[PDB]
Scaffold this motif. Sequence first.
Motif, mmCIF file in Angstrom:
data_model
loop_
_atom_site.group_PDB
_atom_site.id
_atom_site.type_symbol
_atom_site.label_atom_id
_atom_site.label_comp_id
_atom_site.label_asym_id
_atom_site.label_seq_id
_atom_site.Cartn_x
_atom_site.Cartn_y
_atom_site.Cartn_z
ATOM 1 N N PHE A 167 -94.707 8.053 -64.247
ATOM 2 C CA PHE A 167 -93.833 7.546 -63.199
ATOM 3 C C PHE A 167 -93.029 8.368 -62.846
ATOM 4 O O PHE A 167 -92.112 8.853 -63.519
ATOM 5 N N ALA A 168 -92.806 8.541 -61.492
ATOM 6 C CA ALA A 168 -91.967 9.787 -60.694
ATOM 7 C C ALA A 168 -90.579 8.926 -60.567
ATOM 8 O O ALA A 168 -90.390 7.749 -60.942
ATOM 9 N N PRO A 169 -89.570 9.711 -60.292
ATOM 10 C CA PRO A 169 -88.324 8.849 -60.096
ATOM 11 C C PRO A 169 -88.161 7.759 -59.139
ATOM 12 O O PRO A 169 -87.347 7.027 -59.107
ATOM 13 N N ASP A 170 -89.070 7.964 -58.082
ATOM 14 C CA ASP A 170 -89.119 6.831 -56.890
ATOM 15 C C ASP A 170 -90.229 5.920 -57.293
ATOM 16 O O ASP A 170 -90.821 5.191 -56.616
ATOM 17 N N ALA A 171 -90.513 5.604 -58.640
ATOM 18 C CA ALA A 171 -91.686 4.761 -59.023
ATOM 19 C C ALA A 171 -93.116 5.292 -58.793
ATOM 20 O O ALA A 171 -94.094 4.552 -58.673
ATOM 21 N N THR A 172 -93.067 6.469 -57.841
ATOM 22 C CA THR A 172 -94.513 6.901 -57.575
ATOM 23 C C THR A 172 -95.227 7.356 -58.713
ATOM 24 O O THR A 172 -94.539 7.877 -59.637
ATOM 25 N N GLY A 173 -96.546 7.152 -58.630
ATOM 26 C CA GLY A 173 -97.535 7.313 -59.824
ATOM 27 C C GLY A 173 -98.407 8.776 -59.729
ATOM 28 O O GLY A 173 -98.667 9.065 -58.615
ATOM 29 N N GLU A 174 -98.737 9.014 -60.764
ATOM 30 C CA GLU A 174 -99.347 10.306 -61.100
ATOM 31 C C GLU A 174 -100.313 9.985 -62.218
ATOM 32 O O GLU A 174 -99.979 9.557 -63.299
ATOM 33 N N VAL A 175 -101.805 10.641 -62.242
ATOM 34 C CA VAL A 175 -102.445 10.629 -63.372
ATOM 35 C C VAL A 175 -102.524 11.978 -63.788
ATOM 36 O O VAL A 175 -102.862 13.007 -63.252
ATOM 37 N N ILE A 176 -102.069 12.244 -65.117
ATOM 38 C CA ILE A 176 -101.783 13.350 -65.423
ATOM 39 C C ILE A 176 -102.525 13.780 -66.676
ATOM 40 O O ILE A 176 -103.040 14.755 -66.859
ATOM 41 N N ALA A 177 -103.666 12.783 -67.234
ATOM 42 C CA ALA A 177 -104.692 12.977 -67.973
ATOM 43 C C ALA A 177 -105.802 11.885 -67.636
ATOM 44 O O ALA A 177 -105.395 10.702 -67.369
ATOM 45 N N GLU A 178 -106.747 12.191 -67.941
ATOM 46 C CA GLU A 178 -107.911 11.240 -67.783
ATOM 47 C C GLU A 178 -109.339 11.611 -68.702
ATOM 48 O O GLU A 178 -109.720 12.794 -68.711
ATOM 49 N N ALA A 179 -109.882 10.610 -69.568
ATOM 50 C CA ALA A 179 -110.998 10.735 -70.221
ATOM 51 C C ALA A 179 -111.958 9.892 -69.741
ATOM 52 O O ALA A 179 -111.549 8.462 -69.839
ATOM 53 N N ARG A 180 -112.942 10.154 -69.249
ATOM 54 C CA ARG A 180 -114.007 8.839 -68.520
ATOM 55 C C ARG A 180 -115.348 9.139 -68.774
ATOM 56 O O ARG A 180 -115.806 10.352 -69.129
ATOM 57 N N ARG A 181 -115.990 8.117 -68.684
ATOM 58 C CA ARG A 181 -117.693 8.268 -68.792
ATOM 59 C C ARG A 181 -118.238 9.150 -67.657
ATOM 60 O O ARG A 181 -117.471 9.025 -66.611
ATOM 61 N N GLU A 182 -119.114 9.804 -67.879
ATOM 62 C CA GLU A 182 -119.942 10.591 -66.931
ATOM 63 C C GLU A 182 -120.509 9.457 -65.631
ATOM 64 O O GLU A 182 -120.813 8.685 -65.816
ATOM 65 N N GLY A 183 -120.156 10.071 -64.499
ATOM 66 C CA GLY A 183 -120.623 9.360 -63.360
ATOM 67 C C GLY A 183 -119.421 8.366 -62.744
ATOM 68 O O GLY A 183 -120.025 7.280 -62.318
ATOM 69 N N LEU A 184 -118.586 8.665 -62.950
ATOM 70 C CA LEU A 184 -117.282 7.899 -62.563
ATOM 71 C C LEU A 184 -116.529 8.942 -61.368
ATOM 72 O O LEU A 184 -116.448 10.088 -61.711
ATOM 73 N N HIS A 185 -115.833 8.504 -60.320
ATOM 74 C CA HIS A 185 -114.886 9.225 -59.652
ATOM 75 C C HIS A 185 -114.034 9.745 -60.720
ATOM 76 O O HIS A 185 -113.537 9.086 -61.602
ATOM 77 N N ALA A 186 -113.560 10.971 -60.272
ATOM 78 C CA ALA A 186 -112.413 11.391 -61.087
ATOM 79 C C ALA A 186 -111.023 11.357 -60.307
ATOM 80 O O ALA A 186 -110.741 11.792 -59.179
#
Lengths: 313, 315
Positions: A167-186
Amino acid sequence: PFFPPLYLGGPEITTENCEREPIHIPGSIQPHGALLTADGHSGEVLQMSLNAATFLGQEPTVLRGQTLAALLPEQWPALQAALPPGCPDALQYRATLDWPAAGHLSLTVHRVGELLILEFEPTEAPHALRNAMFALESAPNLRALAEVATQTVRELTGFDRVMLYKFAPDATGEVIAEARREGLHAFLGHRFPASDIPAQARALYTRHLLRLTADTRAAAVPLDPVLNPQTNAPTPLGGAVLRATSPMHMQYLRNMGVGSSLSVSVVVGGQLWGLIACHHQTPYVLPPDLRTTLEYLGRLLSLQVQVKEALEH
Amino acid sequence: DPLPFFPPLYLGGPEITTENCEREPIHIPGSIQPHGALLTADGHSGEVLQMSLNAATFLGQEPTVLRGQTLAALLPEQWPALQAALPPGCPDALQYRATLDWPAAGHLSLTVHRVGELLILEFEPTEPHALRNAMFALESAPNLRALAEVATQTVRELTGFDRVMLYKFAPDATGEVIAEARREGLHAFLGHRFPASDIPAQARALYTRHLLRLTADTRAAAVPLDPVLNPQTNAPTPLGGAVLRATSPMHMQYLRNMGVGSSLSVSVVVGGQLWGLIACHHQTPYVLPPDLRTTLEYLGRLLSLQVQVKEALEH
Ligand SMILES: *C/C=C1/C(=C/c2[nH]c(/C=C3[NH+]=C(/C=C4\NC(=O)C(C=C)=C4C)C(C)=C\3CCC(=O)O)c(CCC(=O)O)c2C)NC(=O)[C@H]1C
Ligand SMILES: *C/C=C1/C(=C/c2[nH]c(/C=C3[NH+]=C(/C=C4\NC(=O)C(C=C)=C4C)C(C)=C\3CCC(=O)O)c(CCC(=O)O)c2C)NC(=O)[C@H]1C
């Protein structure tokens, strides 16, 4: 303020009035478990979920008269001591019941004023948590910590996609890490506006640290009565993990092709810093004991985020 | 006056007195406590180098057979997992744990960590919602005192220890007991303070890094490693990370004077400093199995977080 809920003839929600939906009082639950409410003193069952008969194996009326003392003899004194009058709504007590109709149930109880809220879910019955704890601690920086956390959770749970969302200071969001099954959008490195998690939900999440939706197409199950007899008012179900999910949110999950979702709060300095976020492409009820592991991980990540941010600043 | 370590006894170092305390090399005793066994192995080849003298009796094999095989052959299912979990260059604090079914010895807990090019393997015998319930109770404690009291009582209930204390450090390293839960008949230590040389400076440095240590029997004789020095380096084997490492003969004499047979403690680390200790006493010897000790390790982390939170609510 909040609008009244629907079932008290409040206005239906749109993308104009997101901040005014009373997410904590929907008067219903997800159908993979059952909920009873009960009087703090008498142990008198005041509300039940219309599905209770299934899980408990009890003739409907039987329940709505009986007492917890009767209904749960071994448990009822423990509850009394574990959840004293005046305790916070955040405090929870759990037990496993070997209950005749259903092999094993998990029971989770908390207290809101004069009401005990009881949740029943199917349950069951190694070192991955200890191994994860040490792995988190030896991550050299915040980035690596984020990566280890999402990978660990994915390995423990089998969720198709596990993210750390910050969460950023204006509650704006970011994906900073991600582990996912092959064949999903990143979604790694993408940012999302401050209304995608509205102001009233960010307060509930500072307080209660885990929530989930086990099936984004399943219909909620009403409480009967819907209003608490004690107050002739809505039961706060904000502390309940089986609480029904807002219909505005289930619509968003389906537009994504998600059948199951779960998330854990990361709270730092009394503020919501991020979330461990989990997607599943099909419906998926994570059992209570595995959720507990993610609740522990939430606390550990909260500690390590502060540690790691301190060695940059 | 801080002074660098003496060489250990087995390298001709002088014995230790009230005069030269801060200079014992506690991290390289060259022996372990007798309720488990320890092996060291080359981090790349898996050749077994050192073993505690009692290893044959835990592992049910002659010392010379053991030493003649690599970990690939001794631990075929675990060897690849070890190598993934403990990559070269990783910190000595990182631990990997597994449970083994060993023929002669039942269920063994295996704990592994890496120091440079050495793997250190500890083997110990191993055996509902109490932790979850405790986590929430800790978080709902209204202030530091109530937190300290809930923490000590919880640890005593989980472990059965005669005395569990929350020990708190002052800026001068003097310490004080801010809470305890004790067996009936024991004399309270609540509110007593103790001098700064009661936990010397090389031990406070170590307890910031490795967070749990124990003495199951304050009268048991240590079990040497064989050989005593690491053949890779002809130098001492760093056992700072090894919970089975032997305890300093200085400190075991203090416990006996106190009438304690068994001791255990967990660090509360706050802002990178040692904030205090969850300290447990027992009048007789007492081995706490590895999976129960894990619960105490988890509570150590929870308490570190909650101590920060309670203290911030305080200015
Ligand atoms: C006008 C209202 C809208 C709205 C409401 C709403 N949203 C939530 C909860 C969440 N919204 C999230 C948003 C995202 N999920 C993702 O996966 C991504 C990115 C890839 C984003 C940006 C998230 C993560 C949550 C958390 C909930 C969970 O764990 O499932 C609520 C709260 C519901 C509740 O039961 O408390 C509400 C009311 N969302 C909108 O997008 C607008 C249209
Ligand atoms: C000159 C040598 C001395 C010495 C050495 C020493 N002490 C430790 C570790 C500890 N000493 C502690 C002292 C206390 N135990 C208690 O029960 C109380 C009060 C209720 C006090 C003040 C404690 C708590 C520890 C930590 C470990 C534990 O709890 O058992 C070491 C370190 C041993 C090692 O790391 O291998 C050493 C070398 N202590 C002295 O007082 C002088 C005489």
